[PDB]
Amino acid sequence: APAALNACLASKKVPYIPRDSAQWVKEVKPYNLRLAYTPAAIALPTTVKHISDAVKCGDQNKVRVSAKSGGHSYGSFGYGGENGHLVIVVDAMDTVTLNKDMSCTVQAGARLGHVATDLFQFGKRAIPHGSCPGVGIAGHALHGGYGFASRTHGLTLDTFLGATIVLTNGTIRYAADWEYYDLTWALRGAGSSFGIVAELGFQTFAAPETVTPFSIELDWNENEAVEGLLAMQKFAVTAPKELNMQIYMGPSGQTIQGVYYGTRANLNTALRPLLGDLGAQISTASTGGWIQMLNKYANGQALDQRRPYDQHSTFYSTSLMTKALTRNQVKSFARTLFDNMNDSDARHTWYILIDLFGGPNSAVTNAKTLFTDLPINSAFPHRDKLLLWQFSDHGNYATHANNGFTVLKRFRDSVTKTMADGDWGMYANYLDTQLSNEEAVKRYYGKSLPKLKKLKAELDPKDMFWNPQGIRPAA
Ligand SMILES: *Cc1cc2c(nc3c(=O)[nH]c(=O)nc-3n2C[C@H](O)[C@H](O)[C@H](O)COP(=O)(O)OP(=O)(O)OC[C@H]2O[C@@H](n3cnc4c(N)ncnc43)[C@H](O)[C@@H]2O)c(*)c1C
Ligand SMILES: *[C@@H]1O[C@H](CO)[C@@H](O[C@@H]2O[C@H](CO)[C@@H](O[C@@H]3O[C@H](CO)[C@@H](O)[C@H](O)[C@@H]3O)[C@H](O)[C@H]2NC(C)=O)[C@H](O)[C@H]1NC(C)=O
């Protein structure tokens, strides 16, 4: 069957990786080493036509098919979340092209750092995206794309124009608001479930020349954390849009860190109200170029990431997309966390990232259709949320994997217990792997689910493009 496929692929001269070869062992290695899988075949296209033929060779052999770009799926859904998929690795298609009207064409395999590197050097242009340079553009944008430029310039999908996409029947479409309003609407948030994208289009913004990263180091106690976090909610509503912030919380201390697109002295005035509530001061702050800021937050990884790519970790993570927590909700989180922090025996191999996500001064909250003053056509449901939580654990998962799952869930639940069941969601790019399809799609996609399920039945009724937390077609 792996050879039933592999033969079809080479009948259409779709480049494929030979089974159980040296390259097959290097390509089947997931990013998250905790979850590995074994394709039925791996395709390695370099043209849109390869993808189309590869998708047709998938329909022929009744295999589910799944696309992998960067491979940073927290559950290795690039491979399909299971064995026996045809896996179309678009990593080799990474050409960036900057047009004169400031739109760009980015092939579906480009990694974020290769996108910023080529956009700043082809002109001085950029799109908003996350901090990790090795992340693939396809998975990042089709589900959101948040980083230290988002509060100022929006999610990556907010700048999304359209994409050449291969539907389950092999037909190649260019999807944009005019020609395919609903398909493009699904691609802005949940496009992993609807086709194999080969090229994405975005409207770039001018890479700023004056950018100030900053950190504020802290060591809260439980009650200094109920106050400090409540003070940050208020600041998330009022701070200028030039300001981008998150707070790392770990087992031994905290660090408020972010980026202000402006001068140091202006950052000082923006932070004054929050630092007053906190009783804290900037620890490190420096002004420099835009590529400098992306390198400072790349976590040691060189920006211009390309193929071949061999980064790996073994971890479990989850997220939250909350509104402003109440006093008592922040107290439940800090009681449960410092309960863990002060316990010498408990699992301490975790950390938490709380981005300031929405509010009146965030560009995500009222993102618009490009070149318009009308709302954006996007299935992404969380523009009304204020805070983007991420819970991670990078400890042991061979022998004590269920301790890793318990501790992050105990943290996440401590936040949501008192919250109205439909006032909080979760973030698909930070997908919680332990979730039932019903729960996951409820939380990632919210009130877009029915329209998404209606559209899934239109386009992929046999559910070829399958993954554990994918959109299921309506019966
Ligand atoms: C590993 C990692 C992930 C990060 C990091 N930093 C982030 C940040 O600062 N902000 C964020 O908002 N997210 C951050 N993420 C998470 C990434 O955004 C997500 O993990 C991306 O979804 C991963 O994308 P990619 O690198 O392409 O991973 P894949 O496993 O290849 O794909 C995931 C998902 O997308 C589908 N898909 C991929 N390629 C296609 C194409 N061409 N067409 C359709 N669908 C595609 C896959 O099927 C799968 O469902 C920091 C780090 C270190
Ligand atoms: C592969 O599948 C896609 C999606 O299932 C097919 O595209 C869809 O095709 C229909 C008809 O060709 C398009 O027309 C739509 O339906 C009504 C029917 O009355 C038509 O009058 C309208 O023009 C309306 O647009 C539809 O738009 C189109 N959808 C998409 C997303 O492309 C495609 O035809 C299939 N490929 C092959 C080779 O059959």
Author numbering: 31 to 505
Task: Pull verbatim passages from the article behind this deposition.
Here, we report phylogenetic analyses, combined with the selection and characterisation of five fungal AA7s, three of which belong to previously unexplored clades. We determined the crystal structures of FgChi7B and FgCelDH7C at resolutions of 2.4 and 1.6 Å, respectively. Both enzymes share the canonical AA7 fold comprising an FAD-binding F domain and a substrate-binding S domain that is formed by a central β-sheet flanked by α-helices. Moreover, the two enzymes share an aromatic cluster comprising: (i) the catalytic base tyrosine (FgCelDH7C Y454), (ii) a tyrosine/phenylalanine (FgCelDH7C F99) that stacks onto and stabilises the catalytic base, and (iii) an aromatic residue that stacks mainly onto the saccharide unit penultimate to the reducing end (FgCelDH7C F383).
